[PDB]
């Protein structure tokens, strides 16, 4: 009854193995392993912010030679407004609940926050993996710069 999709020595693999939120602004570590000779080394990482993924998506959709191609959708902007607001209300209510109840609700809201964080990391990673598997878009020079250039694209 085994039913397995097998991957053997893939040429280009991109993941986001770690991410940082600081006052709800996210820095994604974008990590590439590749056997392709078009990259400057076989394994490397860069830091990216959401705005950089939007730059990349916009650059690809504005490339007229890609009119016949399907560009994968941009990841959505991280949004922690919900759990953050609940945290602010909770903190204000600390005096009104037992220490036990507070600590339980605190850990629950932290779990909420983490779930939002994981989902956005998913939105961002899937986008890059969809690009990597496209036989044309994976070769795109702007996609390469996005993966390889270890400086802050925004500033
Ligand atoms: Cl952000």
UniProtKB/Swiss-Prot annotation:
It comes from the Eukaryota. Residues 6-153 form the PX domain. Involved in several stages of intracellular trafficking. Interacts with membranes containing phosphatidylinositol lipids. Acts in part as component of the retromer membrane-deforming SNX-BAR subcomplex. The SNX-BAR retromer mediates retrograde transport of cargo proteins from endosomes to the trans-Golgi network (TGN) and is involved in endosome-to-plasma membrane transport for cargo protein recycling. The SNX-BAR subcomplex functions to deform the donor membrane into a tubular profile called endosome-to-TGN transport carrier (ETC). The PX domain mediates interaction with membranes enriched in phosphatidylinositol 3,4-bisphosphate and/or phosphatidylinositol 4,5-bisphosphate. Belongs to the sorting nexin family. This is Sorting nexin-5. It is found in: Endosome; Early endosome; Early endosome membrane; Cell membrane. Forms heterodimers with BAR domain-containing sorting nexins SNX1 and SNX2; does not homodimerize. The heterodimers are proposed to self-assemble into helical arrays on the membrane to stabilize and expand local membrane curvature underlying endosomal tubule formation. Transmembrane segments: none annotated. The lineage of its organism: Eukaryota, Metazoa, Chordata, Craniata, Vertebrata. A 1,2-diacyl-sn-glycero-3-phospho-(1D-myo-inositol-4,5-bisphosphate) binds at residues 21-27, 80-86, 94-97.
